Amino acid sequence: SQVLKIRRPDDWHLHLRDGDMLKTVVPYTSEIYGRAIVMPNLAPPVTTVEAAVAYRQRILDAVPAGHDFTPLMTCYLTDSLDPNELERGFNEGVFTAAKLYPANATVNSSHGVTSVDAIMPVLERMEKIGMPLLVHGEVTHADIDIFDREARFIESVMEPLRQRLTALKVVFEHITTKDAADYVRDGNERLAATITPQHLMFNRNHMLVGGVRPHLYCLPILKRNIHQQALRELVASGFNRVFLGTDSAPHARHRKESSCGCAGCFNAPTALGSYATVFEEMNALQHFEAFCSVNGPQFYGLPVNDTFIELVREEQQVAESIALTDDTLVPFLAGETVRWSVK
Amino acid sequence: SQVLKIRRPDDWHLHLRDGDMLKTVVPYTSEIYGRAIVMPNLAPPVTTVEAAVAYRQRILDAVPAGHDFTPLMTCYLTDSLDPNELERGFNEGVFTAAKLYPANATVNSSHGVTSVDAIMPVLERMEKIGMPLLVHGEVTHADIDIFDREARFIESVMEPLRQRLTALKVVFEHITTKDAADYVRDGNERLAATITPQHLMFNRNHMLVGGVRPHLYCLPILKRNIHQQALRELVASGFNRVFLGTDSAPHARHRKESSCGCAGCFNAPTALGSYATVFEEMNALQHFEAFCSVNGPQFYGLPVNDTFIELVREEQQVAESIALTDDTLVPFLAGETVRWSVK
Numbered sequence: 128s129q130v131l132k133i134r135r136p137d138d139w140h141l142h143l144r145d146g147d148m149l150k151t152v153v154p155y156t157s158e159i160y161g162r163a164i165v166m167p168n169l170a171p172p173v174t175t176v177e178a179a180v181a182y183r184q185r186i187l188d189a190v191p192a193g194h195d196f197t198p199l200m201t202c203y204l205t206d207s208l209d210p211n212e213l214e215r216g217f218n219e220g221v222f223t224a225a226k227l228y229p230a231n232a233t234v235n236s237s238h239g240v241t242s243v244d245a246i247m248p249v250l251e252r253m254e255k256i257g258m259p260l261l262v263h264g265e266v267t268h269a270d271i272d273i274f275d276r277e278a279r280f281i282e283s284v285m286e287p288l289r290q291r292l293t294a295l296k297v298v299f300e301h302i303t304t305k306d307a308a309d310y311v312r313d314g315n316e317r318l319a320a321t322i323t324p325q326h327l328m329f330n331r332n333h334m335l336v337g338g339v340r341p342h343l344y345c346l347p348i349l350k351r352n353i354h355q356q357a358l359r360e361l362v363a364s365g366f367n368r369v370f371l372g373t374d375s376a377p378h379a380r381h382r383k384e385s386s387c388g389c390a391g392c393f394n395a396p397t398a399l400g401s402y403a404t405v406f407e408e409m410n411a412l413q414h415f416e417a418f419c420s421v422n423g424p425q426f427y428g429l430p431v432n433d434t435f436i437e438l439v440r441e442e443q444q445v446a447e448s449i450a451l452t453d454d455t456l457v458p459f460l461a462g463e464t465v466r467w468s469v470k
Numbered sequence: 471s472q473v474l475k476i477r478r479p480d481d482w483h484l485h486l487r488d489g490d491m492l493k494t495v496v497p498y499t500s501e502i503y504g505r506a507i508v509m510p511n512l513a514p515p516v517t518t519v520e521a522a523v524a525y526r527q528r529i530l531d532a533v534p535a536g537h538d539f540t541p542l543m544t545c546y547l548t549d550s551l552d553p554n555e556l557e558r559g560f561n562e563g564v565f566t567a568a569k570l571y572p573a574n575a576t577v578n579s580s581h582g583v584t585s586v587d588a589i590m591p592v593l594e595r596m597e598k599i600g601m602p603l604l605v606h607g608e609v610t611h612a613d614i615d616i617f618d619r620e621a622r623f624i625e626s627v628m629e630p631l632r633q634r635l636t637a638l639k640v641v642f643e644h645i646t647t648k649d650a651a652d653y654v655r656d657g658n659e660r661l662a663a664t665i666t667p668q669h670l671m672f673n674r675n676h677m678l679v680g681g682v683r684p685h686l687y688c689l690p691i692l693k694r695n696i697h698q699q700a701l702r703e704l705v706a707s708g709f710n711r712v713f714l715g716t717d718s719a720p721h722a723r724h725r726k727e728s729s730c731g732c733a734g735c736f737n738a739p740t741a742l743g744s745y746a747t748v749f750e751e752m753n754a755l756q757h758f759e760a761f762c763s764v765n766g767p768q769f770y771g772l773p774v775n776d777t778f779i780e781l782v783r784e785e786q787q788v789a790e791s792i793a794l795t796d797d798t799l800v801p802f803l804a805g806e807t808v809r810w811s812v813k
C-alpha cells in the first residue's frame with residue numbers, strides 16, 4: 128500500500144566486473160540508478176585512461192535501451208602510477224575519482240598501494256585538481272586480527288594522510304565500525320563515507336551462527352553488533368556526508384561456495400529496498416532520499432538527478448539464483464522476502 | 471629422521487556419525503587410538519542405554535580386523551532424560567560420561583536441555599554416582615556475539631554449576647579462549663579440558679583472511695590470536711588436566727562448501743601429527759605423551775595404554791579428499807605437507 132517517491136538514486140560504490148558477468152549484472156544497476164561509481168579492480172586493473180575508455184564502452188554496450196545510466200569511471204592507484212596519466216583522465220572526463228586499495232587487502236588488490244608514501248606525488252596532484260580519493264581503509268599486516276583492520280587504518284593511515292593533505296577530498300568507502308562512523312561524523316566537509324546494505328542489516332552473527340554463510344562474506348568483514356548499531360544510527364541521524372554505496376560485488380556461486388570463498392555480496396538487485404527497510408526501522412524515512420540521491424552528488428560536486436522513482440511496501444521474494452553462461456549467481460537475500468520494492 | 475615414540479593415545483572427544491559415514495571414518499580413529507569418547511549427537515540423539523548399546527555395536531562392526539579399539543559411549547542430556555536411565559547406563563558400563571550441549575528454551579525435550587536449572591535432578595545424580603559431565607560450554611542466546619559465547623558460559627553456567635554441585639567432575643570440552651584456559655588452570659582436581667588441533671594451530675584470521683574457509687569453520691568458533699596463544703601455552707606448560715580431544719566432526723564436502731556450511735573439522739586423519747607439531751613448536755615435546763596418553767586416563771580413572779606407537783618426522787602429503795559412498799570428505803589440512811606422521 129505505502130508508496131515512497133524519491134529522486135532517482137545513484138550508486139557511489141559498484142563492481143560491474145567484465146565480459147559475460149558484466150553483461151549479466153549491469154541491468155540490475157542501470158534500470159534504477161542514474162549513475163554509478165565503477166570500481167577499477169579488474170584483472171588486470173584499470174590504471175590508464177585508455178583502459179578506462181574501453182571499459183566504459185563495454186559497460187555502455189551492456190546497458191539496455193531506455194535506461195539512462197552513466198558509469199563514472201575510476202583509476203586503480205598503484206605505487207608507480209604517473210600523476211600525469213591520472214590528471215589527463217580527470218581532464219578528459221574519463222576518471223571521476225581514484226581508488227586506493229592497500230596491497231593484498233581485498234579482491235584483485237595484489238597490485239594495490241603499498242604505502243601512502245610511495246604515491247604522495249599522485250595524491251598531491253589529486254588534491255590540487257580536486258579529484259576525490261576513494262579509500263578501502265584497512266591495514267594488512269598478517270598479525271593484525273581481521274576485525275581490527277579498519278580501526279587500525281584510521282589511526283595509522285587515514286588521519287596522518289588527511290593531516291598532510293588538508294585539501295584532499297576523501298570518501299571512506301564501505302565503513303563497518305563505530306570507529307569509522309565516529310571519525311566520519313566528527314570530520315570536516317572534505318570527508319565522507321559510503322555504507323552498504325549488508326553492514327546496516329547484519330552483523331557477524333548473521334554470517335557465522337547456525338552455519339557459515341559465504342554470501343554474507345565480504346570485506347571489510349562484518350563486525351560486532353555494536354558496530355552495526357553505530358552505522359544504523361549514523362545514517363538515521365540525517366548526517367549529510369554519508370551516502371549510498373552498495374559495493375555490489377558479484378562472484379559466481381561456486382566461487383562463493385568453495386573451500387576458499389570469495390569476498391563480496393551481489394546486492395544490486397535488492398540494495399535499494401534493503402536500505403528503505405533500514406531507514407524505516409530507524410524511524411528515519413525523511414532522510415532516505417538524501418542518502419540515496421542528494422548527499423553523494425553534493426560531495427562529488429555533481430548535479431542531483433532530475434527524474435524520480437517510487438518504492439512500494441509490498442513484499443517480494445528474492446530469486447534463489449540468477450543465470451550465468453556457466454554456473455549461477457546467488458543474489459543477496461536469495462530466497463528471502465524484502466519489504467520494499469521498486470514500483 | 472627423528473622418531474617420537476608414545477604410549478598409544480586415546481581421543482577424549484570424537485564424532486563417528488552413523489551408517490555409511492561411520493564405516494568410512496572409524497578406521498582413521500581405530501588404527502591409532504586405543505579408546506575414544508564417542509559423542510551422542512546422532513539424529514535422533516543417543517539418550518537411552520539400548521540406543522548406546524546398538525550404536526557401540528555398529529561402531530565395533532566397522533572396526534577393521536586387528537585394530538584394538540574400544541568406543542566409550544555417552545548419553546546426550548535432555549530435559550526428558552530419566553536420571554534412573556542414565557545411572558543404569560553408567561552402572562552397566564554402557565555410558566562412560568554424559569554430554570551437555572548448549573541450552574535452548576525452544577528445543578524439544580526429547581532432543582535437548584531448555585535450561586541447566588531444569589536438569590538438576592540428572593546432574594545431581596551424576597554427582598552422586600561419580601559420572602563425569604562433558605560440557606560444550608557456550609550460551610547460544612541470539613543477542614550474544616558468537617565470539618563471546620564461551621566466556622559467557624563460564625560466568626553464567628559453569629561457575630554457578632560447580633559451586634552448586636561441589637563433587638561434580640567436569641570436562642570443559644574443546645576450549646578455545648584464554649578465559650577458559652585460565653579458568654581450567656585455576657580449577658581443582660574435578661575440572662579438566664580437551665583441546666582440538668585446529669584451536670592450537672589456527673585462529674580466526676586463518677578462517678577469514680584471503681577468503682572464507684568453511685573447513686576451518688567449527689564450534690566453538692576460532693577466536694582471536696591472543697586466545698590461540700593461551701591455549702598453546704596451557705598445553706605447553708605440562709598442566710596435567712588438559713588432554714587430547716580431536717572433536718573430529720565429519721561432514722560431506724557438499725555440506726561444508728555450501729550457502730550454509732556445517733560446523734566441524736574432519737581431523738581424525740591428521741590430528742596426532744598436528745598436536746606433535748604444536749608441542750614441538752612450543753619446545754614442549756616432553757609433555758606431548760602425557761597430553762595424548764596419560765592425562766585423560768588419569769582424569770577418567772582408566773588405565774593408561776600399555777602398547778606404543780611411533781611418529782616419524784618425515785614429510786608426507788595429506789589426501790585432498792576421502793571418498794564416501796556418496797560425495798567426499800575433505801580432511802583437516804587436505805593437500806598440505808605435514809611435518810609428523812605415524813610410522
Ligand SMILES: NC(=O)N[C@@H](CC(=O)O)C(=O)O
Nearest residue numbers: 142233234345346376390391
Ligand atoms: N568488498 C568485497 O568484499 N569485495 C569487493 C572488493 C572491495 O570492495 O574491497 C570485490 O571487488 O569483490
Ligand SMILES: O=C1C[C@@H](C(=O)O)NC(=O)N1
Nearest residue numbers: 485688689690719733734
Ligand atoms: O559442537 C560441535 C558439533 C560438531 C558436530 O558437527 O557434531 N561440530 C562442531 O564444529 N562442533
Ligand SMILES: [Zn+2]
Nearest residue numbers: 233263346347
Ligand atoms: Zn573495498
Ligand SMILES: [Zn+2]
Nearest residue numbers: 140142166374
Ligand atoms: Zn568495492
Ligand SMILES: [Zn+2]
Nearest residue numbers: 606643689690
Ligand atoms: Zn562441542
Ligand SMILES: [Zn+2]
Nearest residue numbers: 483485509717
Ligand atoms: Zn564435539
